[PDB]
Design an enzyme around this catalytic site. Structure first.
Site: not given
Ligand SMILES: Cc1cc2nc3c(=O)[nH]c(=O)nc-3n(C[C@H](O)[C@H](O)[C@H](O)COP(=O)(O)OP(=O)(O)OC[C@H]3O[C@@H](n4cnc5c(N)ncnc54)[C@H](O)[C@@H]3O)c2cc1C
Ligand SMILES: COC(=O)c1ccccc1S(=O)(=O)NC(=O)Nc1nc(C)nc(OC)n1
Ligand SMILES: Cc1cc2nc3c(=O)[nH]c(=O)nc-3n(C[C@H](O)[C@H](O)[C@H](O)COP(=O)(O)OP(=O)(O)OC[C@H]3O[C@@H](n4cnc5c(N)ncnc54)[C@H](O)[C@@H]3O)c2cc1C
Ligand SMILES: Cc1cc2nc3c(=O)[nH]c(=O)nc-3n(C[C@H](O)[C@H](O)[C@H](O)COP(=O)(O)OP(=O)(O)OC[C@H]3O[C@@H](n4cnc5c(N)ncnc54)[C@H](O)[C@@H]3O)c2cc1C
Ligand SMILES: COC(=O)c1ccccc1S(=O)(=O)NC(=O)Nc1nc(C)nc(OC)n1
Ligand SMILES: COC(=O)c1ccccc1S(=O)(=O)NC(=O)Nc1nc(C)nc(OC)n1
Ligand SMILES: [Mg+2]
Ligand SMILES: [Mg+2]
Ligand SMILES: [Mg+2]
Lengths: 582, 582, 582
Positions: C59, C121-122, C171, C485
């Site tokens: 997922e 369930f789930q 469901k 890092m």
């Molecule tokens: C390991 C690591 C290191 C990092 N090092 C750096 C670094 O050194 N330098 C750096 O820059 N970043 C770095 N970052 C990234 C950082 O965390 C931020 O994600 C980044 O700085 C965000 O930049 P931003 O604000 O420009 O973009 P975003 O976070 O995307 O923000 C965009 C902004 O623009 C606005 N906006 C959106 N669409 C529009 C539009 N059409 N018109 C007008 N406004 C709009 C939004 O609403 C928002 O406020 C690092 C991240 C990691 C994982």
């Molecule tokens: C996901 O659960 C619910 O949504 C859920 C949760 C509690 C009661 C009834 C349901 S249900 O009757 O509508 N569906 C259901 O039980 N589905 C399902 N699908 C698979 C593939 N395996 C098993 O059970 C082994 N159950």
């Protein structure tokens, strides 16, 4: 600098620690109504010699009184209530303090910790209920935290944008013995790191630049200026810019001054709204661009560069996007801009005489006005007289509705904290209790509650509080037998179809009901009624002269309408300036 | 079966759809106070001919009135308020209705949808605020949902464990034109699938088994039996088991019957608490094992098999673990057990005479008692007289405190819904408004508010409502110049140290204050004062005989203490039976 | 314009309505992993001919794939998961999409309505869990709402500031038969009324004014410019202002252009950070003043007038207070300012050559650099070669850490949406799945995942997805046997004390572990390893030339350090420019 009633090593009840926590904060007055969950706190209260308690007759009276105390002194208001019904009865007050940004600290008793969540006697999840209507709140889970939480509460309630903070104290914690540690540091890293720093010269000087490059500047002043009375004055003096105020800002700049455009908004003066409508520079200081003031946002100050100075960043760009903003204390900004304005007058040569006269003519053609019919008493006139006889130096608290608008329109406030009115939430029944707090906070001042017959009756039980506490509270009751503001809208938009707006007895349509004079009598408060415009002056003078509390029942024709009026969500071009309910 | 005022194809305002939604629910009365956000609703109200509105003087009066209406009729109470302050003023009422399980439907106006969350005029996130103090709540986001949400609200408020449901209606939705679909199905799959099914014979017969195998059975009846008056009667008739009632259950079984052990709990009779303390079988029907009743859980009914029948599974095993439980309608269970008991009497041969006499002796040695001093009026006596003169057929509403306990102790209720009192939250100021709703719901009944001077004054503004609505509300005000219940605890556990419990004027310690008679006069309500025990009978008789509203100010010595008394969290062995504040 | 597979009067399962709801939105691809609660949805999916499903192996792979799809196409990414574990496995993806503002619509199956809240369930309260990590979310309670909610979700996910929206579908609703109404209006009054209106000429012209009055202007470009590639280009052309980009903004303006200052921030170029440090005018377009970029806020662009244009008002003034702001679409503002700049060039005479050269010298003295040791492969070099051989036209997705920084530093992006990297949340294992979505969205493009050995292994199961879906995904794995890092910080601030940063087998310290080549082999994906800098060019060329998926395991010395580096919360003066882990 502080002397406790206990030895630094002597253990005492959490309740006693909570009270000393208040004394160490400079608290001298609290408005507390005893209940089961707060008994300990009240017992601790009586052990105190520096804190006086004003016992209200209703928890809501307590909060509103605390609000008055705060709004009229600049200090935080303190109210205490027991658990369950006690606590829920403060709700309207908290919401009111939050919307108007009035510093308030509310303490509520709670069932013992182990009983929380079990549907115990007089238990309500107040912290859950009030989270969205308070600036912040707490549930004390250990007596050891009392000192710290109280300090934090007052800090939070007082700093930045003031507001209400509720502290929930379980009864078992109130009874637990401990040795307080007044040295505990506060846990507000986030908040404290976000507190605005003083304004930068760059930002301020850019503003003075915009001022010199404008021809039609207008000052938009609100409640954020209540502590910048002097700074604002010097500022208008150095720039000569006309001042328009909001309902919350009344008094920041004297309404009597010639540079004053008075109040703008839904019921603002035609000239105030005109100034904004045609300004090319809007100086929004300590305001929040309320819908009552802006009407249709797009049409509001549509042809002007907007400068917004607010202590709360969340407010800057919430409704209107400024061309220039300053997140900080307007008092500091004014002082900063004032130095610049003084040391540059020569080269600036600010002269807005042309604009000023373009407005003075509007002020001449469309001034505030009222009509007098026969010998009936015009509410506006009564307030006009009150002003005269008190020389505009009285503290005025009010209810909500038409009388509220007139009290704002026809009385000239000389200073801030003279006007005590619920503007954001607009809660009825605020007038009498608020006057109580104000009076306790200003013992030598003239305190007058300009109330409505509908608002007055809601918390009429506080009259007992007034008598017992011997507060010289004056009540100018503008009695119109109706829910005024609502009947006005019935007339304007509902073909005068009355839908429960009449407050008198239908069995005797032509009889003042109830007889407010007797409510006063019931609490040993001298009162009198006035019906003829001729006796008004002497009646009011009597009220003022008679020592102690006094109630003047001023009868008024109900068909009066507050004007001018810009319909909700309207434009300056939709301003209504004529008509009533006749 | 229903005739609309509109054509099935004719579009009309959401407000008009909301009102017809009420009419289609059988609503005949609502307690609404007009405000800006609810104007449309009020206009729609006046277009209705089947719904009457009782305009209160305070939103809190509205809720409490609605509660009275509900509690005294078995129908849901309907109150309406505007946004902001209107809505927050209902908070205490909602919490009260939730804790006592009284069906209530509250409607509040709201600012237009687009304005929500923007800090608009008179805006409060009521749905957020009331989520923990209501059974459920809604925020209508489309006029199309009105029919469905109203139906759901009433269903939820009325079914299972009754409670309050708040419906938030934005003003723009009230104005939107549409064609209602009264055929819409409800979206309550979860709730409806969890509704208890009728009791199984297996479960019921096991109970009848336990009854036949017991020697000391005791019936623990609460508010859940208010609709099982007849079933319970036949049941006690077939088993001969003594009945102990909670404050909420008063009237389910006649307090005057010889099989009645009256009220148990903190202030329950010595014999009622005794019966439970030594019972070997506890039949808990429609109760929630409150801390007021159980004291220390472990000591409560420690030597007996507990049977608990509740409509709410969450309540079964919350405080005490039963030996047998039945999640369902006690009315059904009683009927089921009744058939079994009838068709097995011969072989059952139930005879609890021995136990019954073991209790009748306790009832003889430790009965409810009061002392009469000189000519002072004993509150207990006044209530005893009221009973006599009304032949115990009056509907009694009360405030909270000592007078509340005495009204419960010294008046014998013949039927359920005759007793209207706030028990869970215990909110002061409930008495007068509650009587208003009760009277409107029972026009030909004797309605008496046995109030306290502290509780009475909190919502004294509803006196105006009473006069204008011409309700024959009688007020038996037990005036003791103090916050009675709190001063009792001061005497018992705080060495009589008064901490703000005195409600009179200290400037005139020996003067009834305020003069409640004048509050009555102010609203054109006849009143009189009584101070001598000798004039009591004639005074009360007058109040009863004088047509219309009436206020009798009964002066009482404040040093009276409600007895017996089991301290909070105590055991039957800690029961206090002697003493007062002298 | 649309042809359904059902008659307008033919009833069909909610599941089928949900799928057509997607088709009507233009959806062509979804990433769904079947589960019990979503079986119906999958069955409906197979009935569709226009929507293809890319079944991931986890997922989380689904969400990240959807993110890649979105980030590389400008379209919203769609992922579907079953209830319980399915739904919770999307959490990291949602938070990632919310922080980076990438439009995403996530649909999750749920247990039947009546089962909600019963610990079925789930079952997981996904709506409760994801409320703070999504832009908005829903729980469909009626099949009738499907059309409307889907339309609203896409609208909300796509408009204003893009983000993730989760739709919870019970469901039983999926199985309920109904006739969809595709005409239903959306219920987003608040949101739609708050959508920014096009920029005003007044605001824009004031900016062009500031530009002409400045001497050291700097463009601060971020992710908000990803759709303003052309507008920004023309803008820089008309003003000649140097461009500094954030990690999210890479590609808005070609990194190869001479006016490009490349990336600023924690690991930004010495000259980019220098430009900002000494700029007198900061043009912040589509940025959010991240702590990675600003370091100590007070020191950031301390000597310059700041202009901030953002589509989200909540962002304007959140960390830094601008001198000028514009709440709106930067694409519109650029176009507006561009017209003004063109029709005023003559009088403006913008010339920033002096400033530009003051920077070009910094660019000359402190350029990005790396060291080559013997025949070891320099990660920077590998990426430099990839650029060359792909002519910088490849779509690059990455993991998080050092390799991520180098991929940003040593590859020149020609256009936006060529760079797919997790910046706000910085979630490891994003690289491979993101490339999958990108490839599906751009079938004819060169897609390369420049991953780390730690990040790669987290979602290595998606290799199976790649083979089965036959996506020509290339993987440039920079293998350094460590959590790069984190080990860098160990070296700099913890005296190289290794605390679980080594990813190889300690039993064989000198052995590449695991053998990534075999993970590839397990899924029938051709792979090869490279250890000598000499074979690098031919190896990469092979990867590129070999049709279909390919994995190149590039071995690198782990002691490399990403430079330059400004310590967290530091100042430009604390910039580290030398050193490694040797
Ligand atoms: C390991 C690591 C290191 C990092 N090092 C750096 C670094 O050194 N330098 C750096 O820059 N970043 C770095 N970052 C990234 C950082 O965390 C931020 O994600 C980044 O700085 C965000 O930049 P931003 O604000 O420009 O973009 P975003 O976070 O995307 O923000 C965009 C902004 O623009 C606005 N906006 C959106 N669409 C529009 C539009 N059409 N018109 C007008 N406004 C709009 C939004 O609403 C928002 O406020 C690092 C991240 C990691 C994982
Ligand atoms: C996901 O659960 C619910 O949504 C859920 C949760 C509690 C009661 C009834 C349901 S249900 O009757 O509508 N569906 C259901 O039980 N589905 C399902 N699908 C698979 C593939 N395996 C098993 O059970 C082994 N159950
Ligand atoms: C019947 C009725 C009619 C009304 N009619 C009108 C009308 O016609 N005209 C009108 O103006 N109002 C009217 N109101 C009042 C109205 O609802 C609003 O309460 C009022 O407009 C709010 O004004 P304000 O924003 O200036 O003050 P506040 O609401 O008090 O807001 C003050 C603002 O200042 C900021 N600030 C606070 N302290 C400082 C500081 N030290 N430095 C810098 N910034 C600071 C705050 O954080 C906040 O944003 C009416 C109300 C009622 C009940
Ligand atoms: C000053 C003061 C003093 C007090 N002193 C006492 C005292 O001494 N003794 C005392 O008893 N109380 C006292 N109380 C009241 C007390 O707080 C509790 O309100 C009361 O004990 C609750 O009783 P209850 O549980 O029976 O009724 P409720 O609280 O009304 O609870 C009824 C229960 O019945 C269930 N039920 C409802 N309808 C049905 C149905 N149709 N079939 C089956 N089950 C159903 C409910 O869901 C619930 O669990 C006092 C209150 C105050 C204000
Ligand atoms: C307020 O309730 C609680 O806080 C509360 C709630 C549930 C259990 C125990 C308490 S308590 O033991 O700590 N205090 C208490 O019960 N006090 C109290 N005070 C007065 C004046 N009257 C009555 O009862 C008639 N009770
Ligand atoms: C209650 O507020 C809202 O609901 C409200 C709140 C914010 C904006 C618009 C409204 S509104 O346009 O739809 N109604 C309105 O403004 N009503 C109203 N009614 C009276 C009787 N007095 C006053 O104002 C003095 N206003
Ligand atoms: Mg009035
Ligand atoms: Mg009393
Ligand atoms: Mg690594």
């Amino acid at each position: 600098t502080f002397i406790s009633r206990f030895a630094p090593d002597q253990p005492r009840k959490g309740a006693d620690i909570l009270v000393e926590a208040l004394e160490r904060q400079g608290v001298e007055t609290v408005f507390a109504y005893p209940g089961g969950a707060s008994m300990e706190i009240h017992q601790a209260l009586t052990r105190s010699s520096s804190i006086r308690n004003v016992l209200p007759r209703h928890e809501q009276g307590g909060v509103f009184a605390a609000e008055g105390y705060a709004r009229s002194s600049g200090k935080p208001g303190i109210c205490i209530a027991t658990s369950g019904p006690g606590a829920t009865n403060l709700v309207s007050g908290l919401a009111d303090a939050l919307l108007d940004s009035v510093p308030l600290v509310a303490i509520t008793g709670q069932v013992p910790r182990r009983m929380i969540g079990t549907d115990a006697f007089q238990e309500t999840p107040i912290v859950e209920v009030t989270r969205s209507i308070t600036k912040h709140n707490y549930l004390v889970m250990d007596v050891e935290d009392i000192p710290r939480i109280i300090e934090e509460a007052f800090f939070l309630a007082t700093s930045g944008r003031p507001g209400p903070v509720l502290v929930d104290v379980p009864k078992d914690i109130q009874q637990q013995l401990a040795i307080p540690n007044w040295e505990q540091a506060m846990r507000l890293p986030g908040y404290m790191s976000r507190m605005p720093k003083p304004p930068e010269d760059s930002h301020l000087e850019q503003i003075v630049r915009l001022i010199s490059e404008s021809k039609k500047p207008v000052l938009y002043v609100g409640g954020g200026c209540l502590n910048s009375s002097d700074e604002l004055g010097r500022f208008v003096e150095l720039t000569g810019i006309p001042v328009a105020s909001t309902l919350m800002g009344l008094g920041s700049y004297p309404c009597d001054d010639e540079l004053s455009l008075h109040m703008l908004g839904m019921h603002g003066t035609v000239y105030a709204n005109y100034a904004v409508e045609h300004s090319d520079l809007l100086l929004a200081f300590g305001v929040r661009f309320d819908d009552r003031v802006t009407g249709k946002l797009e049409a509001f100050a549509s042809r002007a560069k907007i400068v917004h100075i607010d202590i709360d960043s969340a407010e800057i760009g919430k409704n209107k996007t400024p061309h220039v903003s300053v997140c900080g204390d307007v008092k500091l900004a004014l002082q900063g801009m004032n130095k610049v304005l003084e040391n540059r007058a020569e080269e600036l040569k600010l002269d807005f005489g042309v604009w000023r006269n373009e407005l003075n003519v509007q002020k001449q053609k469309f001034p505030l006005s009222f009509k007098t019919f026969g010998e009936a008493i015009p509410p506006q006139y009564a307030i006009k007289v009150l002003d005269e006889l008190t020389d505009g130096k009285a503290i005025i608290s009010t209810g909500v509705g038409q009388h509220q608008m007139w009290a704002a329109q026809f009385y000239n406030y000389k200073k801030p904290r003279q006007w005590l009115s619920s503007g954001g939430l607009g809660a009825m029944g605020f007038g009498l209790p608020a006057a109580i707090g104000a009076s306790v906070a200003n013992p030598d001042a003239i305190v007058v509650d300009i109330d409505g017959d509908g608002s007055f009756i809601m918390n009429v039980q506080e009259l007992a509080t007034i008598r017992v506490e011997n507060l010289p509270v004056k009540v100018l009751l503008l009695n119109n037998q109706h829910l005024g503001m609502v009947m006005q809208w019935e007339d304007r938009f509902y073909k005068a179809n009355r839908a429960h707006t009449f407050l008198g007895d239908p069995a005797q349509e032509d009889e003042i009901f109830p007889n407010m004079l007797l409510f006063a009598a019931a609490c040993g408060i001298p009162a009198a009624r006035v019906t003829k415009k001729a006796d008004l002056r002497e009646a009011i003078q009597t009220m003022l002269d008679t020592p102690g509390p006094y109630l003047l029942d001023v009868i008024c024709p109900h068909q009066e309408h507050v004007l001018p009026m810009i319909p909700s969500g309207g434009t300056f071009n939709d301003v209504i300036t004529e008509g009533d309910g006749r």
